[PDB]
Design a protein around this ligand. Structure first.
Ligand SMILES: COC(=O)[C@H](C)NP(=O)(O)OC[C@H]1O[C@@H](n2cnc3c(N)ncnc32)[C@H](O)[C@@H]1O
Ligand SMILES: [Cl-]
Lengths: 112, 115
């Protein structure tokens, strides 16, 4: 099933894009929870981390490397938090794997 | 002493105790001593990387492996309703051990924002 993140990848609806390559896209979250809050998503439609395959390991790690490079480019020199939500208890809001990167304020503990 | 002298390096070398869930040549999963959810464990690389902001491009497969191990351990622990994965970077992340560590939290409803 297609999601709004598919529409963003296909450029059918606008988003504030930070970075793109052949396999992922980073863009500011439309409902930001911190002064900087962006998502890194794969272009491959993996619905949730629980169904990711072993062959996806490099792609998932690529999301994190892109995330940390984007965080540095956006000036998050005091730190940040990365989050992946799975399912109902995880609070996953879109069934397309997405890495949240949040910073620009003190992040608290517990993380929700 | 491979793995560094953070407490996680010592856990890797079996010098201080841990409740281990899974171990392979690349990583180790073990329960957090200060759980923030009914299930709360960490997945760490055996290679010492101090924080995500200094990970190298060639660490991509290793970082992805942490997530794959995290989701497999979550399934093995019966977290069938979901869970949240977290990596904290630096002061604003609240990082307290400077050895890259992926948290997996589940067994309760997680809230938004994630801290
Ligand atoms: C306030 O936020 C933070 O401190 C974040 C979570 N720091 P962070 O560096 O992201 O996570 C480190 C975690 O490592 C756990 N820990 C520390 N010592 C041991 C140990 N000996 N065995 C098992 N777990 C241990 C702490 O309870 C933290 O949850
Ligand atoms: Cl989500």
């Amino acid at each position: 099933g297609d999601t709004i993140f598919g529409k963003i990848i296909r450029k059918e609806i606008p988003a504030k894009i930070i970075f793109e390559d052949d396999r992922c896209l980073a863009f500011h979250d439309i409902s930001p929870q911190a002064p900087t809050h962006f998502l890194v998503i794969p272009k491959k439609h993996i619905s949730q981390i629980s169904v990711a395959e072993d062959d996806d390991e490099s792609l998932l790690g690529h999301l994190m490397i892109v995330g940390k490079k984007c965080a540095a480019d956006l000036g998050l020199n005091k730190g940040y938090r990365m989050v992946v939500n799975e399912g109902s208890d995880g609070g996953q809001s879109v069934y397309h794997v997405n890495l949240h990167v949040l910073g620009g304020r003190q992040m608290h503990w517990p993380p929700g």
